[PDB]
Amino acid sequence: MSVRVAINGFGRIGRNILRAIIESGRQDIEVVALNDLGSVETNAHLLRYDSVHGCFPGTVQVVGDAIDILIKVFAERDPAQLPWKALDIDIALECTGIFTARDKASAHLDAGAKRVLVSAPSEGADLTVVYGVNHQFLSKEHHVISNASCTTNCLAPVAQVLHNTVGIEKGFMTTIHSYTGDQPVLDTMHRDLYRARAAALSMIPTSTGAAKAVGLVLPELKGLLDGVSIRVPTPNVSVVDLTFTAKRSTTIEEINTAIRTAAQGSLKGILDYTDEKLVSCDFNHNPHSAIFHNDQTKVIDGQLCRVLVWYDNEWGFSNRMCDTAVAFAKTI
């Protein structure tokens, strides 16, 4: 019944995984352990209080070597040292952000987790999964997999619906994105010259791999999409601004309706929509991968089309980590 997980790296997403599990009321995932090299006390405190997501819904105590909500806490620099065999770990959730590589993440297999799921694109991933779109391809042949990114998780279901309805010849994606943890509050030394500037002071153009990735989850679209991002001064919630050329002449109503159909049918709980005049903060804490904004569909001359699609880049994705982990457990 219950799939035994361990969270490696108790950072935003790791904590958000936990919170998604408790909030949703789901009973199919047991969080057996967490690993992180900072204080156990500090970890519980960050779980308790979040500036974006509010108070933990429940009580949070540190008792001995565990956090009671009863989750064992570990501190290993080297994931291969974790007692995953002893703890009968089904799926290790790699969340630290520094072991995204398949080479690197396979350390949890060494430690005795039966499978690994990386909360980010993974280099040499056995499979990159956008739950609700391609998780059905998961099988005994896959041991270390990627959950894609928040952005990929948003763009793909929408891509799919559009391609099925009007066909996408080519498309360009700009994601207007909230600042993330790898950005600094003030200008400072960095791997990337864009992301080195004060995060809450500018619109910052930056790179995203999501459009290429949608080329893989949906092989019909390989090489037909590219994409970039613009980071702006909001702490959470992002949006895909997609312009594409359609293979057949179409309308706003045509596109909106295929979205409503998909959202009400086979992508229920992955894709949603709004006919209301909403702004980014209204999607904060929404669990969908994508929420399509009907108001914003525009179509020039029946063939050049633009859509706008919100996503809580933390909350959507963390709920997807749960679904992917459960679907993945069934192939063990």
Ligand X SMILES: NC(=O)c1ccc[n+]([C@@H]2O[C@H](COP(=O)([O-])OP(=O)(O)OC[C@H]3O[C@@H](n4cnc5c(N)ncnc54)[C@H](O)[C@@H]3O)[C@@H](O)[C@H]2O)c1
Catalytic positions are 150
Q: Which is nearer to ligand X, 101 or 258 (CB)?
A: 101
Q: Does 200 bind a copy of itself (CB under 8 A)?
A: yes
CB contact at 8 A, 231 and 179: yes
Burial of 206 (0-12, 13-18, 19+ CB in 10 A): middle
Residue 267 interacting partner from ligand X, a copy of itself, none (CB closer than 5 to 8 Å by kind): none
Q: At closest approach, how far in Å is the CB of 229 from a copy of itself?
A: 11
Residue 77 among known ligand-binding residues: yes
Cα–Cα distance between 132 and 266 in angstroms, integer?
A: 8
Q: Give the binding range for a copy of itself (CB under 8 A) out of 55-63, 64-72, 202-210, 313-321.
A: 202-210
Q: Which amino acid is at 182?
A: D
Residue from 205, 251, 257, 268 in contact with a copy of itself (CB under 8 A): 205
CB contact at 8 A, 215 and 223: yes
Q: At closest approach, how far in Å is the CB of 16 from a copy of itself?
A: 20
Q: At closest approach, how far in Å is the CB of 293 from ligand X?
A: 19
Q: Does 170 bind a copy of itself (CB under 8 A)?
A: yes
Q: Does 290 bind a copy of itself (CB under 8 A)?
A: no
Residue 159: which of 242, 78, 102, 56 has the closest Cα? 242
Residue 29 interacting partner from a copy of itself, ligand X, none (CB closer than 5 to 8 Å by kind): none
Residue 36 among known ligand-binding residues: yes
Cα–Cα distance between 299 and 322 in angstroms, integer?
A: 36
Cα–Cα distance between 12 and 275 in angstroms, integer?
A: 31
Residue 269 interacting partner from a copy of itself, ligand X, none (CB closer than 5 to 8 Å by kind): none
Cα–Cα distance between 222 and 177 in angstroms, integer?
A: 24
Q: At closest approach, how far in Å is the CB of 215 from ligand X?
A: 18
Residue 119 among known ligand-binding residues: yes
Q: Does 293 bind a copy of itself (CB under 8 A)?
A: yes
Contact residues toward ligand X (CB under 6 A) are 8-14, 35-38, 77, 95-98, 100, 119-120, 149-150, 180-181, 313-314, 317
Q: What is the DSSP letter of 145?
A: E
CB contact at 8 A, 218 and 278: no
Q: According to DSSP H, which parts of 84-149 are helical? A: 102-105, 107-110
Q: What is the DSSP letter of 280?
A: G
Cα–Cα distance between 296 and 308 in angstroms, integer?
A: 6
Q: Is 71 helix (H, G, I), strand (E, B) or coil?
A: strand
Q: Which is nearer to a copy of itself, 81 or 243 (CB)?
A: 243
Cross-strand bridge partners of residue 133? none
Q: At closest approach, how far in Å is the CB of 216 from ligand X?
A: 16
CB atoms within 10 A of CB 165: 18
Site residues for a copy of itself per CB under 8 A: 170-172, 174, 176, 193-194, 197-198, 200-205, 223-226, 228, 230, 232-234, 237, 239, 241, 243, 245, 277, 279-282, 293, 295-296, 298, 300-301, 303-304, 306, 308
Q: Which residues are annotated as a binding site?
A: 12-13, 36, 77, 119, 313
Q: Which residues are annotated as a binding site for NAD(+)?
A: 12-13, 36, 77, 119, 313
